């Protein structure tokens, strides 16, 4: 699909058997989701945003379905204003910016 | 052009006569540039994201050229680690997300 940017590029994703809304974020290196329980062991990590650094839980090799497209990678869980799908997963589904 | 996401989507922009490298960000509502003394009236504003909020100065109707594509709009200037071109300017250059 082709997505215009008049509205936030929010799409439905499936993760851990649950449905969630996430922003397709080209300005994010990583994928960060709001606090939720995910199967598997997690490692403490710190990432930076516009307002500073936050502590997150790092989950590896997690399958995520983005608008029907499959991806399996690192997912971070922590205090974020919105769920974001970063470049680590966007590259897996072949997402590109065009103009 | 078509931009892949293997690396951060950084491109050259021109604002206030200066050439800069900025991140094309679909996850940014606004365009935020690192500290620079632009002439003109501005209004104080607060924007947030991961880590919290930061204070920025809002400048309106500023001409910005993104990869040869002209645009004009609101630009925020504050203590940001990177220059970010948000949706307010991306829509003007007909930028879309494709996968």
């Amino acid at each position: 699909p082709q997505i215009t940017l008049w509205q936030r590029p929010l799409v439905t994703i499936r993760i851990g058997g649950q449905l969630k809304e996430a922003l397709l974020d080209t300005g994010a290196d990583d994928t960060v989701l709001e606090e939720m329980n995910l199967p598997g062991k997690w490692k403490p990590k710190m990432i930076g945003g516009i307002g500073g650094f936050i502590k997150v839980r790092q989950y590896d090799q997690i399958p995520v379905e983005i608008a029907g497209h499959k991806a399996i990678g690192t997912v971070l869980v922590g205090p974020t204003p919105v769920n974001i799908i970063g470049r680590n997963l966007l590259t897996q589904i072949g997402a590109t910016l065009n103009f | 052009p078509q931009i892949t996401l293997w690396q951060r989507p950084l491109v050259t922009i021109r604002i206030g006569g200066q050439l800069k490298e900025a991140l094309l960000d679909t996850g940014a509502d606004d365009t935020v540039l690192e500290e620079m003394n632009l002439p003109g009236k501005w209004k104080p504003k607060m924007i947030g994201g991961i880590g919290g909020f930061i204070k920025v100065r809002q400048y309106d109707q500023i001409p910005v050229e993104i990869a040869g594509h002209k645009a004009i709009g609101t630009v925020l200037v504050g203590p940001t680690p990177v220059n970010i071109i948000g949706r307010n300017l991306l829509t003007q250059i007909g930028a879309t997300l494709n996968f």
């Binding site: 922003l23 970063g86 | 940014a28």
Partner: peptide, 5 residues
């Protein structure tokens, strides 16, 4: 990682 709200 820049949302910007």
């Amino acid at each position: 990682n820049x949302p910007i709200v």
